[PDB]
Structures are given as C-alpha cells and as structure tokens.
Point group: D2
Chain length 245, copies 4
C-alpha cells in the first residue's frame, strides 16, 4: 500500500479509465473522492470501494462549472483532510469533420476536456502545493498525433499537454509533480457519445481489428507514475495498442 | 500583383499583425475584408487602403460570436464576390501564473484564440473549397515552445496548431491550403492587454533587450505563403527574433 | 513474484549506471540476462553478483559501434540462453560542448555508439524478437525531447534514436514486437565523467548540483514497468524528469 | 538584387534543390561557391551561371570528408573574399525496412546527411560569425513526421533539426541566423539512389499521384529566408505538397 494516508480526487470516475483509476488508487491505500455527473453510478462504485475497505467521498460534479469545481475541492479537503493526488480524467470525444460540424460538439469538448481540467487544476493547486502532491492529466494519443475527423478533440488534448508542461515549469520546484498520461485506443464508453453518425461508425470499424487497451492498463500507468519516488516526475507516459500502427 | 482578383478576409485587422497583413495583401492586388471590434480603427485603415486604390469591406466582428462570424463571412462573399484567403489573426495574450489566476483571462483567450478561429475557419470553408483558397492561422512561438506564465495562452496556440494540421489532412486534397504562421516576439499592442500586472511587467523587461519582429515582417511571411504556387502548402513558418535565445 | 520468468534479456551498457540497474531489475523478475559492454572486469563482477543471487548470466564483451561484434554478441546470446525476448539498447556516451570549434571525435563517438550502435543492435536482434514477440527498449533521453545549449550532437543522436524507434514501431508493431522508448532527465551515473570539453563539463556539473537527480534504479523501474505490461500494450514513451528541475 | 556582394556556399549543388538554390541566390546577386562530387555537372552549372553574369567558385567536395570540408571552406573565402550564407543541402535518401537492412545505407546517410552537415557548419562558423551570416539546413518533412521504411533517413533529419535548434541557441545572439528548410516530396534525382528495390518501387507509386514540389519552390523558400531582415530568423519553413495528406 504505497499510498496509505493519501487523498486522491478523480474526475470522470463513473465509468472507464477514471473508474479503474479510482479502484487502483484505493487498492494502494488512498482515500478517494470520486467525481462525475451520474451520481447513481458513483454511488454504486462508492459502495463497492467502501465494502472493499476504502474511504470514499462521492462528488456530483460538472467540471465545466467553475463554482462547482471550487466547491468539490473544498468538500474533498473537508471530508478527507487534504489533497495529495488529482486525476483530471473527465473528458468527452466528439469526432467528425470540421466541415459543417455541429459546433456544440466543440463547446462541449472545450468546456470539459480543456477548461474543466484547468479549473480543477487551479482549485486543487493550493492543496497540492502544501502536500507536495501530484496532478495527473488524462491526455491522449490525440495530444501527440493528429488524424482526420478529430480536429477539435485533438486541439483540446494538445492544449492539455501545453497547459500541463507549462504548469510543470511553474510548480515543479515547489514539489508538485505534473504527470500526463497519453493512452491510445482504450475500451470504454467514450466513443458511444460521438454525435456525427458517419464518423462514429468509421471510428468503430477502424478500432474493431485491434486488441484495445483496457481501462485497467491505463490505471496501472497512473499507479506507476504516482507511486514513483517524489524526486521523479513521470511527466509523460505514451501507451499505445501494440496491434495499432 | 500576385493576388489580383482575389479576396482576403483578415480578422484582427484593426492593429498589429492583422493591419500589416491587410496592407500587404491589398498591395498584392487582393480585395480585403477587414474585421475587428474597434470599428473606428477599421474605418481609418479602410479609408487609407481605399485611398491607395484597394477594394475594402469593413466588418465589425467579435470572432467569439458564432452568429456574427456566419454573417461576416456571408457579408464578405456578397460584397466582394467570393473568398480566396482567410487570415485568422484575431487574438489576445493574457499572461500570468496558473495559480490563483483570473479565469476570465482563460475564457477570453479560448473564445478568441481557439473557438473564434475555429468558427471563422468553419464558416469560410465552403467558400474556400470552391475557390481552392488558403486559410492562414496566426499561431505563435507559443504553439511550439512552452515558457512560464503563459499556460493557457500556449494551450490555445498548440490547440490552433493541432486543429490546423488536422484541417490540412481533411481539406488539402480538395485544394484548400492550410498555412500556420508562428511569430516570436513582435512589436504590437498585444502585450498591453495582460491583466496580471506583475507578469505584464516581467514580460516587458524580458523583451526589452531584443530587436523585436515587426508587424510588417509577419505580413511578409503571410505574403510569401499565400503567393506560393497552389501545389505548395507552406504549412509552417516559424519566425524568431535573431536576438532571442 | 517473477513476471519475466523464462525470458531472455540482452542489456548493452551493462557495466555501470542505468544498464547495470536495469540488468539487476530484469534478473530480479526472473529473466536470464546477457550483459554487454567494453569493461569486461566490471561485467564479470556484476555477473558474479547476479549469478550468486540465483540469476542466469551471459557475459558479453562488446563495442556496439562494431557491426561484426554486434552480430556475434546476439548470436552468442541466443546460443547460450536459448532465445531473445527483450533488448535494452542502453550503451551510450554524452560528450557536451559548443558546436563552435568542437573536437569532432566527440561527434563520431556519439554517433557510432548512441545512434549507429543502437541501430545495429536493433537490426541483429530483430529476427529473434519477431519469433518471441519480444520488446526492444531504447534508452533515449530528455535530450531526445528538448534542446539545450552545448548538447547539439548528443541531442541529434537522441532525437535520431526516437525517430528511428517510432518508425521501427510502425514497421514491426503488427507482428507483436513492442518498441519502448525511455527518456530520463538527469540521472546520477558515470555518464558525465566522459565529457571532453572541460568548461562545459564544469558548467553541466554546476547546473545539476542543485537538484535531486534521478537514480539509475528509477530508470530500471521504468523499464520494468514497460516490459511487464501486457503484450497488447506498448508503452512507447516514458518521459521521466527530476521533479526539482524546470 | 537583395544579396549583392554576399557570398553563398551551396553543398549538393550538382542537381536538384542545391542547383536551384545556387541559381536563385546568384540571381539575387550573391557570389556562389558550388560544391558536390560530380565535377562535370558543377562545371556545366558554373559555366551557365558565369555566362549569366554570376561569380562562381567550383568545389569538388565530399561533405563526409572532414579535411575536404575544411579545405573547401578555406578555398571559398580565399577565392570569394568571405562567407555570408552556407546552404547545407548535400544529402542522400536510402529507403527500406530496418529488418535485414543493408547497413551501408545507414553509414552513407549518417556520413552525408548528419556528420557532413555538422562538419560544414563547424568549418563555416568562424566566417559566418564575422559576417553575421546565415546557415541554411536542408532538412525534410522526414525531420518532422515519421513514416515506414525511412527509419534511418528520418533519424538523420530529426537529428539535423535538433543539432540546428541547438546551434541557434548557441550563435543567434552573435547574429548568425539558423534557418531550417523542411520540404515534402520534391521532384529531384534523390529517389533514384534508393538501394532497396521493393521500397524504391513502393515510394515511386506513393508519390506518383501528387503534384510534387519543384526544386525551384524550395529555392524560393531559401531565398525568402535569407533575404529577410537580419533581426528576423526564419528558423523553420515546412513546405508540403498540397495534394499530399
Ligand atoms: N477511451 C479511449 O480510447 C481514450 C480515452 N482518453 C481519455 O480518457 C478520459 C476518460 O474517458 P473514457 O474513460 O475513455 O470514456 P468514458 O466515457 O467511460 O469516461 C468519461 C468520464 O468522464 C465523465 N465526464 C464527462 N463529462 C463530464 C463533465 N462535464 N464533468 C464531470 N465528469 C464528466 C463521465 O462521467 P459522467 O457522464 O457521469 O459525468 C465519465 O465517467 C477522457 O479524458 C478521454 O479523452 C484518452 C485516450 C484514449
Ligand atoms: N505580438 C506578438 O509578439 C505575437 C502575436 N501573435 C498573434 O498575432 C495575433 C494578433 O496579435 P497582435 O497583432 O500581436 O496584437 P494586437 O492586439 O495589436 O492585435 C490583435 C487584434 O485582434 C483583434 N481582436 C481581439 N479580440 C477580438 C475578437 N474577439 N474579435 C475580433 N477581433 C479581435 C483586435 O482588434 P479589436 O480590439 O478592434 O477587436 C486586434 O486588431 C494574435 O493571434 C496573437 O496571438 C503571435 C505571435 C507573436
Ligand atoms: N545519466 C543521465 O543523466 C542520462 C543518461 N541517459 C542514457 O543512459 C544510457 C546509459 O548511460 P548512463 O548509465 O547514464 O552512464 P554510464 O556511463 O554509467 O553508462 C554507459 C554505459 O554504456 C557502456 N558503453 C559506452 N560506450 C559503449 C560502446 N561503445 N559499446 C558498448 N558499451 C558502451 C558503458 O560501459 P563500457 O565503458 O564498459 O563499454 C556503460 O556501461 C546512455 O545511452 C545515456 O545517453 C539518458 C538520459 C539521462
Ligand atoms: N527531393 C525531396 O523529396 C526532398 C529532399 N530533401 C533534401 O534535399 C537535399 C538535396 O537532395 P535533392 O536535391 O532532393 O536530391 P539530389 O540527389 O538531386 O541532390 C543531392 C545533392 O547532394 C550531392 N551529394 C550527395 N552526397 C554528397 C556528398 N557526400 N558530398 C557532397 N555532395 C553530395 C549530390 O551531388 P553529387 O553526387 O555530385 O555529390 C547532389 O547534388 C537532401 O538533403 C535531401 O535530403 C528534403 C526534403 C524533400
Ligand atoms: O486513436 C484513437 O483511438 C482515437 C482517440 C481515442 C481517445 O483519445 O483519440 C484520437 C483522435 C482519434 O480519432 N483517435
Ligand atoms: O515569446 C514571446 O514574446 C511570448 C509570446 C508572444 C506572443 O505569442 O508567446 C509566448 C508566450 C510568451 O510569454 N511568449
Ligand atoms: O538534462 C540533462 O541532465 C542533460 C542530459 C543528460 C543525459 O541525457 O541530456 C540533455 C543534454 C543535456 O545537457 N541535458
Ligand atoms: O515524403 C516523402 O516524399 C519522403 C521524403 C522525401 C525527401 O525527404 O522524406 C520522407 C521519408 C519518406 O519516405 N518521406
């Protein structure tokens, strides 16, 4: 139990990567504040983790809401005593051409993937500074490589990376570690949300012929990064499916 | 006159790089639609350009306004007959630490630098597709390199770059050229807007000891890129002050 | 527990630093280790240590810049240990100094060892890795990701290693050969003792004196994490920086 | 004539991009030292340029030869009075898989593309420092993007870029400008040299259905960069064929 007595706040914890990460960190002895919009799914996970001997704090949160963000962080510190690890995992992937796009796709991705992550980072920062803690940014291969029909999604993830590198420069000397996780195709609910029907089906066929990364693989990457000695910042882990060029 | 009979729409044309670019493209024989919020400054530039023999269409526009963007593009095509060149130059640079930041800095930069650019791009695209035209994105060294106290600004510019590369992959085969200009320190009004006083002062001192790039230098980069033969897409020009490591 | 039981790892640059720690780490996971470098005395000492701890060891005197020596070293490893599952291309040298009026033997040495030697080893190992659906680990650097003054040619070799390795990944990944690239920042090893430009050697020492450096063991743990990941996952890049260092 | 009284040394001047660049610079009034191994082709070009009113210095040079490099630079400064522009254009592209590769492909590419370029840069530097001149590195899309069957070639070109950025940091404050040109597919003799037959054929098919960049397009990129005002360093120009995703 490398994380005994530590407090982790995980956004997007109701499914996929965030759910696996919350489990992984709790398994290492961390108290976990689990945040997302689907409260019933969070409660179900919270019950499971509590029944497994973990300390859980359930947070109904929209990361795009600046006020909600500030309250969520304050609630976590109040209920669990501090903040050692923030996992900015909440995100959505809305694929489709730039041409004649539904721009609500764009505003949603920017609010959640970029602004939400930045809001959470900022609110957590005073607490992470005191605990010499770690912020883990859930980026993507989409923050390293551009492919067609993912322009704005890729814009958000490249943006996350630049924000995070800059953040590292700003806070690293005070012992706040900045970790960026960059998964390739991972088998989650993420793709079910694509609003462009033609691209949703194109993407599904594209990834149908590979062994996908599992949510647990990515949780393991986070676990490796956060349990590394404090003098080491695993700033980037770029993990790809072996089957995928 | 390499651009005779062509129409260019330049956002952020009321000062700085956009003003110089509008002059440069007009000098090459292009009809210019000049867009920004300060109508008085646009009118003054429009008068000067018209007095020099250019065809000018003045557009009062906030690029963050989706509806205003659509109307501005439609107004341009109606008044000037089409669209061959879009210069997405409207932008703001609000520097300061992430820690305890004024988050209105962030929303402004994202709305203008990222969302505004993407809105203009999308609205212009049908017209650029017909004319096999060129979209010029005004990025920055901040889209290539991260320094302290520019996290969200750099996020927007790295985002612009990823969006633009992806756009290139999507439209290049149909003859729409995607050009990204990346200036280093350029002597404009840009820095006057920084809301974090300590950072504004720090930045001023940092750039006080170099010969800065001039707005005209960047206009020249744009002119070189857009007058290149159609089979060549000058996708990136990274121009730095020689005095600046 | 032993995630690499029955696997064979060949580690170049095993006589000190990161390669030594990596050979220990892999052996601790149950892998048989072929340890390769030029200082045979140091290899023998490590080999004795590992053998005494219950490991299977094959000692290889090798200059990675030697194309023929490379081929023989791979052949010797597969003959002695039965196959090849993991290659760690760790052999390397860092010769810092300005471009201006540089001692160009600095350059040829770095290119021969860091770039060409790594490529030769990769190529010779590949038929064996293809059969075993194995993993090649490239020891790159922060120098393959960021450029600073007085490390022009070294950074050229490391950026070169990264492009070579990404391209390799595209070529072999579908046949189940995983390409892993490890990118340490400042790590406390013998590496810097070799700098021939005296002024730069001193400048570098002062710059890194103010930080808690990465340990060779930290980097070995990165390698361990990457190679013990399930086969369907290729941890293509791990970029590990000293927390103290902007 | 923006380069009147300037001296340019161009490596790889016997064909392709180097030939076009030597013509373009001479057209701007620069004296040109033209260097390559095929003396006969250099003399024919030298005759052409001299007949057009240019000052020409013919140099038989293998850039992989460190002593030949030193003599070539000394010969140039002796014959033409100094050195204002170096174009490191000599290069070879030997494509093929890593698996079972002919490793003489590798040593040739490293000797010419990387070491030869570095040798030339180093020998020229004292002279460039005096003249506050410009070094132009002929990199490639292969220094920016990795594709299959170009591993070692891409290694040399990514290497050239890192070397050159580092060089910029080291010499830029003393007024030596470092320019990196990155062409995509350009119609030259380059591809005729590929030793791996299957890959040579695969590459030819790949580039058969695009309008390729012309050697003259690349020469124009060099010309734009070197005639920019001294306070501006056009550090990167990334030029892609518009037809090529
Ligand atoms: N799956 C993949 O192939 C890859 C995914 N990623 C990244 O991983 C992250 C997690 O997504 P993934 O697990 O894949 O897919 P999921 O859809 O399963 O997870 C997304 C999670 O984010 C939450 N969420 C979405 N919007 C908000 C919001 N406005 N406020 C708070 N929480 C929100 C969702 O919970 P709820 O709806 O209850 O709010 C959900 O739990 C994303 O950042 C994604 O970009 C990166 C690389 C590869
Ligand atoms: N100066 C520099 O060192 C560098 C600048 N850049 C980029 O260059 C671009 C132009 O900036 P620069 O000329 O330097 O500085 P300026 O402030 O002089 O120009 C910015 C222009 O953008 C306009 N603008 C701002 N917000 C909006 C909006 N929401 N809608 C429409 N127009 C808007 C302003 O006009 P108005 O107020 O009338 O609307 C103004 O004309 C920006 O994209 C910037 O990021 C990139 C690299 C270096
Ligand atoms: N130390 C650091 O801060 C960092 C180092 N690195 C990389 O780590 C790798 C290992 O270096 P590190 O452990 O740091 O320093 P060391 O000097 O301690 O290790 C270098 C190892 O490589 C071997 N070696 C050198 N040249 C050759 C050659 N021609 N043929 C075979 N073996 C050779 C040496 O053994 P011998 O002399 O007996 O042959 C030695 O075992 C290098 O590739 C380096 O670039 C990357 C990031 C940071
Ligand atoms: N064509 C393309 O698609 C692209 C090419 N490039 C780069 O452009 C540069 C020039 O190539 P390009 O013009 O296309 O092809 P060419 O083969 O036509 O030109 C290469 C030139 O380099 C010379 N050369 C080769 N080896 C040496 C050497 N050892 N010493 C001195 N000169 C040498 C050749 O002349 P000689 O045999 O007489 O010595 C020739 O003049 C290269 O660096 C290449 O990597 C970059 C991006 C795209
Ligand atoms: O490679 C993939 O699976 C997907 C992806 C998935 C989630 O980041 O992100 C990038 C954009 C895209 O379509 N890629
Ligand atoms: O280098 C500079 O002058 C400035 C800049 C200016 C406008 O992009 O962008 C980056 C962010 C910053 O502070 N840099
Ligand atoms: O950051 C550092 O400590 C050193 C280094 C060390 C080993 O790669 O590589 C890069 C080049 C340099 O000076 N950096
Ligand atoms: O895109 C291309 O045409 C070629 C190329 C050509 C010359 O650098 O460089 C990259 C490596 C490759 O195959 N690409």
């Amino acid at each position: 139990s490398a994380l005994q007595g530590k407090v982790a706040l995980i956004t997007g914890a109701s499914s996929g990567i965030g759910e696996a990460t919350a489990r992984a960190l709790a398994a290492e002895g961390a108290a976990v504040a689990i945040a997302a919009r689907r409260v019933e799914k969070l409660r179900a996970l919270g019950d499971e983790l509590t029944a497994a001997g973990a300390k859980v704090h359930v947070l109904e949160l929209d990361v795009a809401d600046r006020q909600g963000v500030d309250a969520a962080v304050a609630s976590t510190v109040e209920a669990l005593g501090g903040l050692d690890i923030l996992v900015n995992n909440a995100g959505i992937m809305l694929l489709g051409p730039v041409e004649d796009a539904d721009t609500t796709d764009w505003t949603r991705m920017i609010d959640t993937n970029l602004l939400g992550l930045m809001y959470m980072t900022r609110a957590a920062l005073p607490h992470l500074l005191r605990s010499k803690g770690t912020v883990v940014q859930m980026s993507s291969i989409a923050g390293r490589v551009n492919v067609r029909n993912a322009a704005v999604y890729q814009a958000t993830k490249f943006g996350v990376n630049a924000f995070s590198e800059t953040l590292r420069q700003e806070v690293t000397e005070r012992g706040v570690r900045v970790v960026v996780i960059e998964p390739g195709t991972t088998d989650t609910e993420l793709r079910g949300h694509i609003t462009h029907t033609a691209t949703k089906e194109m993407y599904e066929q594209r990834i149908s012929q590979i062994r996908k990364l599992q949510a647990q693989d990515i949780a393991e990457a986070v676990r490796y990064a956060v349990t590394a000695p404090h003098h080491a910042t695993v700033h980037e882990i770029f993990i790809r499916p072996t089957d995928q060029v």
